[PDB]
Write an enzyme that holds these catalytic residues in place. Structure first.
Site, short mmCIF file in Angstrom:
data_model
loop_
_atom_site.label_atom_id
_atom_site.label_comp_id
_atom_site.label_asym_id
_atom_site.label_seq_id
_atom_site.Cartn_x
_atom_site.Cartn_y
_atom_site.Cartn_z
N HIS A 1 3.32 7.41 10.81
CA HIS A 1 4.59 7.30 10.17
C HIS A 1 5.69 7.84 11.06
O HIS A 1 6.49 8.66 10.67
CB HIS A 1 4.56 8.00 8.85
CG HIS A 1 3.76 7.31 7.78
ND1 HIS A 1 3.64 7.81 6.53
CD2 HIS A 1 3.01 6.18 7.79
CE1 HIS A 1 2.86 7.04 5.81
NE2 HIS A 1 2.45 6.04 6.56
N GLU B 1 0.82 -1.18 0.00
CA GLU B 1 0.00 0.00 0.00
C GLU B 1 0.86 1.25 0.00
O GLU B 1 0.61 2.17 -0.78
CB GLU B 1 -0.91 -0.04 1.18
CG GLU B 1 -1.93 0.97 1.12
CD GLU B 1 -1.60 2.23 1.82
OE1 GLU B 1 -0.47 2.49 2.23
OE2 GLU B 1 -2.53 3.01 1.94
N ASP C 1 -8.29 1.30 7.87
CA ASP C 1 -6.94 1.84 7.73
C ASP C 1 -6.68 2.74 8.92
O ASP C 1 -7.51 3.58 9.25
CB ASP C 1 -6.77 2.57 6.37
CG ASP C 1 -5.39 2.91 6.09
OD1 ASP C 1 -4.56 2.57 6.91
OD2 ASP C 1 -5.12 3.51 5.07
O1 LIG Z 1 1.75 7.93 2.50
C1 LIG Z 1 1.77 9.09 2.48
N1 LIG Z 1 2.92 9.92 2.36
C2 LIG Z 1 2.48 11.34 2.39
C3 LIG Z 1 3.19 12.52 2.31
C4 LIG Z 1 2.50 13.73 2.37
C5 LIG Z 1 1.11 13.76 2.51
C6 LIG Z 1 0.41 12.57 2.60
O2 LIG Z 1 -0.97 12.64 2.74
C7 LIG Z 1 1.08 11.36 2.54
C8 LIG Z 1 0.62 9.94 2.61
C9 LIG Z 1 -0.62 9.57 2.71
C10 LIG Z 1 -1.20 8.29 3.27
C11 LIG Z 1 -2.52 8.06 3.01
C12 LIG Z 1 -3.15 6.95 3.47
C13 LIG Z 1 -2.44 6.04 4.24
N2 LIG Z 1 -2.79 4.90 4.82
C14 LIG Z 1 -1.75 4.41 5.43
N3 LIG Z 1 -0.78 5.24 5.24
C15 LIG Z 1 -1.16 6.27 4.51
C16 LIG Z 1 -0.49 7.41 4.02
ZN LIG Z 2 0.88 4.73 6.19
#
Ligand SMILES: O=C1Nc2cccc(O)c2/C1=C/c1ccc2[nH]cnc2c1
Ligand SMILES: [Zn+2]
Ligand SMILES: O=C1Nc2cccc(O)c2/C1=C/c1ccc2[nH]cnc2c1
Ligand SMILES: O=C1Nc2cccc(O)c2/C1=C/c1ccc2[nH]cnc2c1
Ligand SMILES: O=C1Nc2cccc(O)c2/C1=C/c1ccc2[nH]cnc2c1
Ligand SMILES: O=C1Nc2cccc(O)c2/C1=C/c1ccc2[nH]cnc2c1
Ligand SMILES: [Zn+2]
Ligand SMILES: [Zn+2]
EC number: 2.3.2.5
Lengths: 323, 323, 323, 323, 323
Positions: free
Chosen positions: C292, C163, C210
């Site tokens: 994260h 993902e 999620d």
């Molecule tokens: O992965 C990502 N890297 C980013 C860097 C800047 C802005 C962002 O919105 C993101 C981002 C979004 C995200 C979206 C749904 C997710 N579900 C699990 N992890 C997820 C991560």
């Molecule tokens: Zn994530």
């Protein structure tokens, strides 16, 4: 270039005085609308259906019978779809097709396609039959003031076909009629003879009506470059109110609240928005509860809210056109 | 293999004390900046234009006169437009251009092109002269501390040209400057000789200033991968306030309110976001009432707010660099 | 063709009475889930790794041993990444694969990739190890009922791989597993033999879990086409509260609040959303504070919230499936 | 990354002794292929149709029955088309699928759709029933030898479905069976368990037949990466001509002439070509006088040409494989 | 949609008697065309220029004064260019516009732009003035016989505009006028009222004249879907020579040299090609030596070649319409 493509940024309306607001409010009838304009539109009317046609005809018959000099085009046309190529028919009705500049009111006159389910048929009374009739009524009520157009600026109405997806929503399947027109327009020169300007340069504001007729509607201010006209809609509501000319209405249930909106809704404004036309997108948020269900019918429309919006909408227009 | 491009996720500020804060708030002068840095930028300065060269020029002079070892570049380049090919010059000032890692502040120095109306001229004081002046004042005020830069990190500025659309907003008619620079940076080994890492790897955080200077700004928290940094602005704003170093300021009108914003605004961060640079987009929401009107002038700037944000930005930036 | 693909548009839950809900609440164990479903998964498990295979085995094992005739498939594939072609593996678990309609629950078993730092490891407790364990713990807690399936409708679980971005979140570097399977299914006719309908026409609803796991989530109502089902989780949340069956819970800290959301979040649902599958995106807004970060670990999960969501979801499903 | 997927570039034929060439040209009957493998497919067979299903089954009859351990896979699938999603079924007959490397022969088993006319039906003798029969006649004729595969190499036939346009030829309306399978094999680790080597890697060379079976045809050398493999046919035509084994065959009317080609032909190799699989495109040039005519029928096939090509080809095959 | 769209595929010419050929070949006068059509058009006439208007106007006057009931539309339309927007006008002369099926002749009437070099101006005599002329002449030569159209099949001339790049030939910068008409035709029901057949479906064959009027020119046969009409241009050539109605003409330098070409020439046919129209592209290969030089002028045309052609074409056309 010249510089009339920029007049729209400086155009200001001619506000009305109580006495004249009284006339407009008296001037519209919701019951003539419910009956002569709207009730014939509450049919299945998906593209290519016999309803698309009878609706199409209906719309015309009702304009064709006013006195103002409405020029009526049918942009019939062909577009591909999940079930193959199919035929669509936009309706443009125009005053002063050389009126270099135009304010545009628009809705969609199609209705989603659904199979009948336990004998029930989808007619979209909010999605978007009330908007069609609302527009019809506006022409009707403003007819006499609209004669006075024989700023180089008139009014245009558009009833798009093919707004709803056939199968399932996606750019490739949706906005058939307005994707076409947006582009056929960007490549028609205006006024006739022009050389670097299109019919899109003369759309001052696109005012789109979608999903209207449910109770307690609330419209956001979507774009910053039509905000000032939204602020007019606010004020026209507030003042029609403070003068007792709205029905069942209160400032704590206003329709136009000075809250903005985060994301975008897709709709027949998108093809134009993306080419730089300013859009006043009168779609409520949240959608009506009956959205895209067989209950989007006449039974669940709110007569008094439509009537109030007719009055708000008719004022905004005359004000914009200085009539 | 080196993992220095990750050092940015674990990067922590070296937060400052109440002596330090008092000292900063002390050594920034909204009134010098107003006269020396911003009043020159307040001219029609759309790309092309004499304004543009003046401003370009202004900007570089006021940097060239400070003591720290700034390196200015003028990426001048061609790119297509609706009016044919045209020329843009971005301004990049940089300390320690081998500082492997860089924090980057940025804005756009053009002004949008508008014809002339009632012998009025669009000069963009918030869109975006004020941010440009703000940036130039910060280099001034921090100068003696920036000297210290002879963790391998330094600071860099960028003043983008051609942010605004020539005709009408679109992917293709906009962000000429930043689209250009984002590509050229994605393709430039950083540091010289590197094999797999580009200069974008070296951009910590891009702080991008747009539409600053109006009263009662409210800056959303737009991205989760810069949100601890937005927290630091919240926290800086707070202390500078509880310590009485902001002017006309109350917490009931904070500027950084912990509110999250739906969509994405389009702006010079886009080409760097979609390539994986973190962005701290200091643009307000809603935009200023004067946006893209001839009223985006100096008479409608709020001195006090701009001065408050200087302090806030200046402290952010020192804490980031550990100075 | 047949109209069964529209059935999903009219399908009502079989709401459960108090005694039923007391049973469900007593049937799920958060500690069993925590011990036997979830602690195995809190490892570095990014695509490739020993983690990924250990995680993958673990999931199927735990599914394998249940009484209902679950059909686990792997779907290993290969896709390009900014480091080359790497190999991925989605998990599908189906009941009654001939069930023309399935309700789907899905999440993501890969862990984002990070360099160890300070001798810590990203293990992605909420992102998304907990949602994997909940789906697991629902297959167990509901097994006796789920056996009854030997309306043409049953349940699929999907655990997606890849993902997260490998380097930097972009459409190109993200959702490897779900963009694969969206396509695969849009091109697999369903039911076997058919000639116009895909495996996606037989997704009634995709419930994407999620980032569940943290204290005080709030889930927005992302889509109008799945809102009725969001309302049902509102109703379930309420009734299970009114009945004693939630822990450390108050309705002034509801999980599901009627709050619609602005712009779209990108997640394994998008390859399905834009092909027309109605989606229910159980992701919170705002994201967890530990998003994260290395701190997204076991220590920062509110067992008590997760328990409450286990129950809400388990009911949601029996009500959809009419068990 | 490992070695073997580069072998196909160092691969050489076991050129065959004057004698064995006799055995070959002796062990192929043209009239067995005409009655047993060819006349069955001389029927309407656009996709979905009854002919389609019949042909797909005929093809299998024949492969299944030979001694060698052909592994058959229908690959049914769905795709969008100018009349909507429709279904399509490729056929793949494989030996030693564990054989990492495969020499692959291919063609298209559909017929193009026409209305009827004169009560006449289009059947595709040239395009491409005969190509099909030839591949069958080939697998028969050589079955006893193929048997020997129990270098790690082996052979694979592929009959594509839906190569022809429903409506009009376009990359959006054509090559439905090959666009699909290319992708499905691009995304498939080969051999099982591999982590970087798809199933295209083990595609040594792609011999595609098409529009074969009129008299006096000309096959240009198309691609440099297979000109060595084209020269062998040129060499094979010769020596079989010099040795008396052809029929009705001038050398001043060879099939394989030295004469490169300017542009490309669109055909079921494109998908596999864009991804770098060596192709050998036995389509004539020009095209037969009958192409996409009702006359592309059995009366205008030349028994001798075909019989000539079955000999060349089967020797080409046996040399490639070292039997 | 029914089948009349397929009538073309099966359409056959009404070959002519050597009596008629003379009758015809007598009936064209290379010299009147040369002073009556050709010379007027020899003027600078890139798009937007007064020569553009001057030439457009000339084209119609001549068709106007003709007897048949030619229906000239004018497709003025706007498009984007490297110099920005600019206007363009296509000319459509048609007969029996209700004729479902048409044969279509075309060339382009604009001239490439060039600066002025040592007092010379470019007038593409070859490119493509002559072609405008040859087509006009045909409309003369045959009018009395065209009259006979009051199979539902008729004729249509098209003179495109903006065929020549403005600057550097490129997809985005060429064929402005033909790209616009293929699209407008692709989306226009034909006949009026139809529900899935466009105006393109009526184009039986597009004959595209370009770069004609140098001496000894070789026209290749470019497309299999139209080779049977190339052969008719041979048959007609070869028979008119042996009948002696050709001038300065050997059969050792025939124009229509059944010789095949490799790649594709970009030209105005393309937009029509990729929508499935059948094309007979009469563009010599190689191009004239004069090509895109000041020298592409009257001096270097070959009165005899042109007259010859003038004769083949007119025959071909009469044979296509059966007249
Ligand atoms: O992965 C990502 N890297 C980013 C860097 C800047 C802005 C962002 O919105 C993101 C981002 C979004 C995200 C979206 C749904 C997710 N579900 C699990 N992890 C997820 C991560
Ligand atoms: Zn994530
Ligand atoms: O048609 C639609 N199908 C959807 C499926 C999922 C999510 C969506 O937002 C939609 C959708 C939106 C929509 C937008 C404006 C409309 N105006 C009238 N009907 C309207 C519908
Ligand atoms: O330039 C623009 N023309 C628009 C028309 C309709 C909606 C819009 O959002 C815009 C727009 C946006 C915009 C966004 C960020 C900016 N930063 C500085 N100026 C900015 C302008
Ligand atoms: O199918 C086609 N319709 C066309 C119309 C105009 C021009 C063309 O080149 C084509 C064409 C090409 C084609 C290519 C490979 C084939 N293999 C079997 N049939 C085949 C046909
Ligand atoms: O315009 C062109 N510029 C080129 C540069 C290099 C190679 C080319 O083939 C061209 C070219 C082709 C072309 C095709 C049809 C034409 N009709 C009139 N001019 C024509 C020109
Ligand atoms: Zn701006
Ligand atoms: Zn030319």
């Amino acid at each position: 270039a010249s510089a009339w493509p920029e007049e729209k940024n400086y155009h200001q309306p001619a506000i009305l005085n109580s006495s004249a607001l009284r006339q407009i409010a008296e001037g519209t009838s919701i019951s003539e609308m419910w009956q002569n304009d709207l009730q014939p539109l509450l049919i299945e009317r998906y593209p290519g259906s016999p309803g698309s046609y009878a609706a199409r005809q209906h719309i015309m018959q009702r304009i064709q019978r006013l006195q103002a000099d409405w020029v009526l085009e049918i942009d019939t046309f062909l577009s591909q779809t999940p079930y193959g190529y199919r035929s669509f028919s936009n309706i443009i009705s125009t005053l002063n097709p050389t009126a270099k500049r135009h304010l545009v009111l628009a809705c969609h006159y199609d209705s989603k396609y659904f199979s009948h389910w336990n004998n029930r048929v989808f007619v979209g009374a909010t999605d978007s039959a009330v908007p069609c009739a609302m527009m019809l009524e506006l022409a009707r009520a403003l007819d006499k003031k609209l004669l006075s157009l024989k700023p180089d600026l008139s009014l245009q109405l558009i009833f798009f076909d093919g707004e709803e997806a056939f199968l399932h929503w996606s750019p490739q399947d949706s906005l058939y009629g307005s994707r076409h027109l947006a582009a056929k327009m960007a490549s028609t020169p205006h006024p006739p003879g022009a050389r670097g300007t299109s019919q899109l340069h003369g759309m001052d504001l696109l005012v789109l009506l979608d999903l209207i007729g449910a109770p307690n509607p609330t419209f956001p201010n979507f774009f910053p470059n039509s905000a000032r006209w939204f602020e007019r809609l606010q004020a026209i509501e507030h003042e029609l109110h403070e003068l007792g000319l709205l029905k069942d209405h209160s400032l704590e249930g206003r329709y136009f609240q000075n809250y903005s909106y985060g994301g975008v809704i897709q709709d027949d404004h998108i093809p134009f928005l993306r080419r730089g036309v300013p859009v006043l997108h009168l779609i409520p948020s949240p959608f009506p509860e009956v959205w895209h269900t067989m209950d989007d019918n006449e039974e669940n429309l709110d007569e008094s809210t439509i009537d109030n919006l007719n009055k708000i909408l008719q004022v905004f227009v005359l004000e914009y056109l200085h009539l």
